[PDB]
2-C-methyl-D-erythritol 4-phosphate cytidylyltransferase (Burkholderia thailandensis), 230 residues
Amino acid sequence: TSRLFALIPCAGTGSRSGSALPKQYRTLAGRALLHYTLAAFDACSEFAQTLVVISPDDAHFDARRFAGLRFAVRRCGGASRQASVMNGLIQLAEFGATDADWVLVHDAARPGITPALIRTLIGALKDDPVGGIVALPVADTLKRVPAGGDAIERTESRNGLWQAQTPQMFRIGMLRDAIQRAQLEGRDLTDEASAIEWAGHTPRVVQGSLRNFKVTYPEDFDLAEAILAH
Ligand SMILES: Nc1ccn([C@@H]2O[C@H](COP(=O)(O)OP(=O)(O)OP(=O)(O)O)[C@@H](O)[C@H]2O)c(=O)n1
Ligand SMILES: [Mg+2]
């Protein structure tokens, strides 16, 4: 009976992407970056609603560029990603969400997300007491490079290491309280799983895809444009 809610943190600036316009609004193959994320969730009718969190100062979001897609947008963006997620989780109650419902937090900067991968995550963790994330095992040899230079100090082990992606699937009640705990202890975490972990819970990993990579630096735009439109 647990309903499915989607939460798209979209209140970032994309400072590493070198784009003056927020990278989530950057046009790829004649289409906005965010549009690919929303279209993927829109294809999944089993979702109750998709909430997009944008900054209160966002003057670039144009709803007309996303017409036909089923989603809602709220200007409850925070100073950080975790804050934007926290405000979003609170905001979900407006749409009838409860603490027992699932929430799937997905980066807008990951346009390669597909309905198949969404439903793979859901189907694998729907009966899980905690939930989990989509992720990718570290395939490359890890090198330690001291900050400030390009010199390699030594080789680090990659055994048992995964690179976390999104969506990150957890219960609204457990996730909100976890982040609330993290903020109460002065911790700003990188993803939702981290809060779940520090709260004392054990999240799961589901095999992700390199197609689901996040656009982060100027190379990624043309690369995603190659990955997309295919
Ligand atoms: N204060 C913030 C910061 C990030 N995000 C969202 O979190 C997702 C992934 O975070 P990231 O890749 O780091 O995007 P940015 O923070 O905007 O870029 P940068 O880290 O280079 O500044 C993005 O969809 C971004 O919009 C958000 O909603 N509110
Ligand atoms: Mg960031």
